[PDB]
Amino acid sequence: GTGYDLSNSVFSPDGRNFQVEYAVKAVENGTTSIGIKCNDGVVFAVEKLITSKLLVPQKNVKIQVVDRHIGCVYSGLIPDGRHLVNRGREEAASFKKLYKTPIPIPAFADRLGQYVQAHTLY
Amino acid sequence: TQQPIVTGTSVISMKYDNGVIIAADNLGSYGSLLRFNGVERLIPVGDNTVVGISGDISDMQHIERLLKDLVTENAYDNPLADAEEALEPSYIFEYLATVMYQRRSKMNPLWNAIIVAGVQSNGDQFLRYVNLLGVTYSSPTLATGFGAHMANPLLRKVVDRESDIPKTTVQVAEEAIVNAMRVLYYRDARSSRNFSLAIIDKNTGLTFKKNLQVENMKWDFAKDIKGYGTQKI
């Protein structure tokens, strides 16, 4: 039968999580942005579609910083991304408070992964 | 429900024609044991503010942390973080004020006395105090602990009221501040000779001097004292 795609945590007979994949589509329908790692850093950049001349130039910023040494850029449903950054921030703070040193990138990433992966469990 | 342990003594400050100065020594006392000799107690926040703190050091250290976070979080989604929407002295102070009164009202105070000195976006000097009970006030001069007793009388002979601020120079002011500091070393058993001074001028910006010392000391007269009254030699 079907219907294996009306609920987010349901595995389909082929072992996929359809809602996760429909999510990806919302992504693909979005602006591009990239990240180029380099010899001692990383660069981020995003396309920012100019919907109208009414938009005030250089104001609706999209890239976001986490702590003071982390840049975050995403494509898709902007708010979902912001939500993801608020948690990132909170998780960065929690790490610093307890360990003093600012959150290592690998560690930051995993903190992000785990929160996202969690959104495919219920 | 606490009792300070490692502590730091006075913090003195005064505001002049185009800025403010503030200072504090580098000691962390443990009762009568002058335990730690390299404790900065003047905390620079950004480029237009320095917050001096006296009281329990562990709580100070906690307030250091709160201040860095306040800075980190103001940068967030703030395109104007290093300009028009940068942390002003008044913002930092009202935050700290708020925390102090909330901790006192919960009966778990941050055992400190704090002076926030700085200059505002529009050029106005800012100098104000808040302590473990949430009491706050402002004056052309301000000091905590012994400094309130000794330093204030001195610092006030230069700036007795508001009108004197525009007539006072950095040189005058800094001179005063260093003398008061010297005085305190003489009469405060918990002072140290080493200290930190900082000026926040509406033009030169923030100057923070580390490793100053009390000099020009008058101790020579001690030789002509013998006994406590009737003793001759």
For residue B181, which of B164, B173, B207 has the smallest C-alpha distance?
A: B173
B2 lies within 8 A of chain A by CB: no
Mutate to test the interface with B, among A58, A89, A91, A103 (most CBs of B within 10 A): A89
- How many residues belong to chain A? 122
- B27 neighbors B190 (Cβ within 8 angstroms): yes
For residue B28, which of B13, B17, B39 has the smallest C-alpha distance?
A: B39
B144 included as an active-site residue: no
B77 lies within 8 A of chain A by CB: yes
Cβ neighbours for B169, distance < 8 A, ≥ 6 positions apart: B16, B17
CB within 8 Å: A65 and B79:
no
- B27 neighbors B8 (Cβ within 8 angstroms): yes
Between B57-75 and B89-105, two packed helices, what is the crossing angle to 10 degrees? 130
Distance of CA B5 to CAs A116, B30, B146, Å? 44, 6, 18
* A89 neighbourhood in chain B, CB within 8 Å: 73, 76
Cβ neighbours for B51, distance < 8 A, ≥ 6 positions apart: B42, B43, B45, B63, B67, B92, B93, B96, B114, B115, B116, B117
The amino acid occupying position B149 is: H
As for how many domains chain B has, the answer is 1
Q: Which residues of B141-158 are buried (b: 16+ CB within 10 A; e: fewer)?
A: bbbbbbbbebbbebbbeb
For residue B72, which of A35, A110, A90, A79 has the smallest C-alpha distance?
A: A90
What does DSSP assign to residue A56? P
Among the partner residues A59, A89, A97, nearest to B76 by beta-carbon distance: A89
- B165 neighbors B159 (Cβ within 8 angstroms): yes
B229 lies within 8 A of chain A by CB: no
- State the structure-solving technique: X-ray
For residues A82 and A78, give the distance between their C-alpha atoms in angstroms, rounded to a whole number: 6
Cβ neighbours for B72, distance < 8 A, ≥ 6 positions apart: A67, A68
Beta strands per DSSP E along chain B: 6-8, 11-16, 19-25, 28-30, 33-36, 42-44, 49-56, 112-119, 125-131, 136-137, 141-143, 194-201, 205-213
What's the resolution in A? 2.2
- The CATH number of the domain holding residue B36 is 3.60.20.10
Which residues form the domain of B38? 1-233
Number of Cβ atoms within 10 Å of the Cβ of B140: 22
Bridge pairing between strands A70-72 and B125-131: unpaired
